[PDB]
Coordinates of C-alpha atoms in Angstrom, one line a residue:
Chain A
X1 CA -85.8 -127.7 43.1
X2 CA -88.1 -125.9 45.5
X3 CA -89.1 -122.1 46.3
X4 CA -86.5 -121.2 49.0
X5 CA -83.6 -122.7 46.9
X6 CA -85.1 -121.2 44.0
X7 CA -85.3 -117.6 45.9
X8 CA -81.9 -118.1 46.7
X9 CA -80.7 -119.1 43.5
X10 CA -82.5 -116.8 41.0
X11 CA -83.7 -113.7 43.1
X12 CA -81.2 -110.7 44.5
X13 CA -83.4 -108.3 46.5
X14 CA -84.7 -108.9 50.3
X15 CA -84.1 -105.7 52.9
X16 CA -83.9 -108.7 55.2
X17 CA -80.4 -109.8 54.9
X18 CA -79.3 -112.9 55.9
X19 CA -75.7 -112.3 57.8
X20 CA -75.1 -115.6 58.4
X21 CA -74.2 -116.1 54.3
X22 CA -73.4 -112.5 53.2
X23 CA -70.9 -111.9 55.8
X24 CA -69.1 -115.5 55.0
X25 CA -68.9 -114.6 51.8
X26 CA -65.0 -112.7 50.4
X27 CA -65.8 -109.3 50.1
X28 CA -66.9 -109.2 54.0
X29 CA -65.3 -112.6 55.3
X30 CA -66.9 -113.1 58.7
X31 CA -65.9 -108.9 59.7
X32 CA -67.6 -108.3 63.6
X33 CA -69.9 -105.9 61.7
X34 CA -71.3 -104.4 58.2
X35 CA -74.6 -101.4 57.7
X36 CA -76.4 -102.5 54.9
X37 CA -78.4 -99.7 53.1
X38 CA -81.5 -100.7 51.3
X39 CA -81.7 -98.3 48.9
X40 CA -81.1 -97.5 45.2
X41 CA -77.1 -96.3 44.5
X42 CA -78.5 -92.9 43.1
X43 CA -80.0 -91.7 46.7
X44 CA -77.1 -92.4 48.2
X45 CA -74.9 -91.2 45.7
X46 CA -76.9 -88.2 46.1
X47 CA -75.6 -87.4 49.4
X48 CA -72.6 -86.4 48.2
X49 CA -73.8 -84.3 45.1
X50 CA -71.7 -81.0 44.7
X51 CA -69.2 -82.3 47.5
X52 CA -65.0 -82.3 46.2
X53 CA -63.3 -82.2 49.0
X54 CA -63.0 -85.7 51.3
X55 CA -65.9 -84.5 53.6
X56 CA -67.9 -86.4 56.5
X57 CA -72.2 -85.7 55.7
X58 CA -74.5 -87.2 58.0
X59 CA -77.7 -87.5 55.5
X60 CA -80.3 -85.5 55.9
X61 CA -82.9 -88.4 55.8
X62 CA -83.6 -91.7 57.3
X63 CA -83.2 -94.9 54.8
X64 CA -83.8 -98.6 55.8
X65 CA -80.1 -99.9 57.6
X66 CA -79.6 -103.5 58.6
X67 CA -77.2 -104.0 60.7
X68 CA -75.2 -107.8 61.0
X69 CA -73.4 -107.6 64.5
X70 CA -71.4 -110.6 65.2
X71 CA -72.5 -113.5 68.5
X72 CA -69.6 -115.1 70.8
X73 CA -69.7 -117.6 67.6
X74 CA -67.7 -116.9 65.1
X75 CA -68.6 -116.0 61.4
X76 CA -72.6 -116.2 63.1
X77 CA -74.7 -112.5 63.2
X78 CA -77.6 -111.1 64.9
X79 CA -79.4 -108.8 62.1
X80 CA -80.8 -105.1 63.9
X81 CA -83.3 -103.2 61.4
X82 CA -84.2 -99.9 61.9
X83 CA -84.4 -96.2 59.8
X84 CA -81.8 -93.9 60.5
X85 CA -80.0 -91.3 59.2
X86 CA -76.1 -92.5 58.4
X87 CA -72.5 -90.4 57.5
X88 CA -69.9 -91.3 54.8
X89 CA -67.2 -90.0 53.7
X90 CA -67.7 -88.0 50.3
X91 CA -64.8 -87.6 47.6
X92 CA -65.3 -86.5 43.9
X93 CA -69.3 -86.3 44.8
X94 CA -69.6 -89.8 45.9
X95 CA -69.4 -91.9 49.0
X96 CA -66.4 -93.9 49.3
X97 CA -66.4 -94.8 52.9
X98 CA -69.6 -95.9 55.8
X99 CA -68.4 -93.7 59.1
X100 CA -71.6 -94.5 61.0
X101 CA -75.3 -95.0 62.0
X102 CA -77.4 -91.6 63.7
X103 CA -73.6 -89.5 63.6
X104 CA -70.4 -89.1 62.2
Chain B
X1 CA -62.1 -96.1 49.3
X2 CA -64.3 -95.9 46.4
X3 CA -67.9 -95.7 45.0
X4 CA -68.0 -99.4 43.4
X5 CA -66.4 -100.8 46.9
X6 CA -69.3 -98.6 48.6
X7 CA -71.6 -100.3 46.5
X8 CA -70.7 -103.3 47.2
X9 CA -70.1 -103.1 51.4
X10 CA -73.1 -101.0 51.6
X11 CA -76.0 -100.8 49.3
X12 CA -78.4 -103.9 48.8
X13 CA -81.0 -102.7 46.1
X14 CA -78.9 -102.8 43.5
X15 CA -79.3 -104.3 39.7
X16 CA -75.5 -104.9 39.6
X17 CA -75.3 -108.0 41.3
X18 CA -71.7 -108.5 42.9
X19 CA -71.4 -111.1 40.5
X20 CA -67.4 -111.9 41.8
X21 CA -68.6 -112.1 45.4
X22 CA -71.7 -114.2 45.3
X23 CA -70.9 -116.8 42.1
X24 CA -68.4 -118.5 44.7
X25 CA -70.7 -119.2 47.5
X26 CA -71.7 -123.0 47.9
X27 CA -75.0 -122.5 46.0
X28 CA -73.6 -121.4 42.7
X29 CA -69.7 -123.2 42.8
X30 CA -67.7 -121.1 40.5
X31 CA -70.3 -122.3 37.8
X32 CA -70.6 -120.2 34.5
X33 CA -73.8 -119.4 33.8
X34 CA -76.3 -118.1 36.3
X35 CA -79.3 -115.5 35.9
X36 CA -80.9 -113.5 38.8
X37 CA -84.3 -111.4 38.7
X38 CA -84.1 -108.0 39.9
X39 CA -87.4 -108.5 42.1
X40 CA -88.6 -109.1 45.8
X41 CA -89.7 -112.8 46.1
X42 CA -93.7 -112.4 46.0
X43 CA -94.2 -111.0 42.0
X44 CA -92.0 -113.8 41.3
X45 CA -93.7 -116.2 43.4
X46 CA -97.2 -115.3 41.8
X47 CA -96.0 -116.6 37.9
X48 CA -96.7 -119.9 39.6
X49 CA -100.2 -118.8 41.5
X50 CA -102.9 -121.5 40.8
X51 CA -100.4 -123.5 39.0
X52 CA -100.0 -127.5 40.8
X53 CA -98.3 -129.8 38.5
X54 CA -94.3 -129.6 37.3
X55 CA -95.0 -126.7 34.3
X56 CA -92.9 -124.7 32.3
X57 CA -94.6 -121.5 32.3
X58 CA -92.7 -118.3 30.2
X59 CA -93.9 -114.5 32.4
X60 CA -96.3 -112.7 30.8
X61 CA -94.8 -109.7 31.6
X62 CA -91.2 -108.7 31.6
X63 CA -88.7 -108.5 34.5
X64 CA -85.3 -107.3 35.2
X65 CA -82.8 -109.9 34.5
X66 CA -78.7 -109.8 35.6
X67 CA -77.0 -112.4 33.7
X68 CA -73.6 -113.8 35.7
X69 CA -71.5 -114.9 32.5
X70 CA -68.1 -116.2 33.2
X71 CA -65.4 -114.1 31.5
X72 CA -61.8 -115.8 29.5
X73 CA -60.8 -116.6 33.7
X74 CA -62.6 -119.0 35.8
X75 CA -64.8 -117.8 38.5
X76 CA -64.4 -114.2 37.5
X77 CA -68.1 -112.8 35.5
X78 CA -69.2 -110.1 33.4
X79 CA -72.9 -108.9 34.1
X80 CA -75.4 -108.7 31.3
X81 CA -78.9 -106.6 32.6
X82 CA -81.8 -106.8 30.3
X83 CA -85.3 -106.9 30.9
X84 CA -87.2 -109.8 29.2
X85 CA -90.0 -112.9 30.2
X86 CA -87.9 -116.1 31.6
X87 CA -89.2 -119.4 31.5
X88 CA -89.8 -121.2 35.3
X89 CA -90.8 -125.2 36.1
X90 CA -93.9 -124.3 38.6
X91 CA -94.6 -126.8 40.9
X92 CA -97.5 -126.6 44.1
X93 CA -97.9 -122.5 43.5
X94 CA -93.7 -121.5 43.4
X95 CA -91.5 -121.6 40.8
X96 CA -88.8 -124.5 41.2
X97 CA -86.4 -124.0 38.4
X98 CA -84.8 -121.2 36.1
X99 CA -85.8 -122.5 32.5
X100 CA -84.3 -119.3 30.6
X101 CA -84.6 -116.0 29.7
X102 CA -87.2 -114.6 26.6
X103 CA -88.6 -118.6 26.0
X104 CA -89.2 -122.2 27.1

């Protein structure tokens, strides 16, 4: 019924994340904090190419992270972008856990 | 505790929309049809460029399409990707509706 609805209806990419209605939703349900990485899965995935053993591996690039950090209100963020390099865990050559932002 | 969960907590330019996670938000209510453009807003915003009155106007050019189809139980989807043209009501330079996918 207009463009904004329409956007939010129809299209799934913006690298600005709005917290406020990703973090209500189930899979994060209103959490203090999540890293979102905007990036393809096969960069990432990347990371942790030729790694078996459950290993922490800082990357050794920067990707676009926003961050939704939770206010004194609850289920309501303030979104942080910024570049940074970031660590996960690695198992079976793929990422199955965010450690952190800049270190492990 | 996995790549897919990664995916899904983490990465956020991805064509496999969390179908699961965002088909229960307010704006799509369990429903069991919905389709969403693999695309930043402004190449989808431009189908509508120079176009004023309500029109149903099919892409001339194809774009990544993630169908959300519910499965045999409520609220729970498989994802169909395709690329294709899709069919949008334009009205004062934005599309407005979702028409469909391949025609008018």
């Amino acid at each position: 019924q207009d463009w904004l609805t329409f956007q939010k209806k129809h299209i799934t990419n913006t690298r600005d994340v709005d917290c406020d209605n990703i973090m209500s939703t189930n899979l994060f349900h209103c959490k203090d904090k999540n890293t979102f990485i905007y990036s393809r899965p096969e960069p990432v995935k990347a990371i942790c190419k030729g790694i078996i053993a459950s290993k922490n591996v800082l990357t050794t690039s920067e990707f676009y992270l926003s961050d939704c950090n939770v206010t004194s209100r609850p289920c309501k963020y303030k979104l942080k972008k910024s570049t940074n390099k970031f660590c996960v865990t690695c198992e079976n050559q793929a990422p199955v856990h965010f450690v952190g932002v800049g270190s492990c």
